[PDB]
Amino acid sequence: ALGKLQDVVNQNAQALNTLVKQLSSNFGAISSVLNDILARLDKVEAEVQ
């Protein structure tokens, strides 16, 4: 019955779960975790990743 209101709730949850799941992505870097980058690499290389 209330499909329009539940749709507005579901779209805002879908958008936030997408925004947070995007923290797991590499974007071409050696790792998705900053402390892993900062442990593997010296300053000038870590800054580029």
Added chain:
Amino acid sequence: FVIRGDEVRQIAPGQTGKIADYNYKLPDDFTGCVIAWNSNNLDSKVGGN
């Protein structure tokens, strides 16, 4: 200053190692020219200088 030829790689912005960290640290945003030459004809002796 004077150093061993193998160590000259440490005389650059943001490096690490005994010369970089205990003797002569360049800043990460260094603007300048690093100039070097072999000086064995001046700085070197039998039994060691």
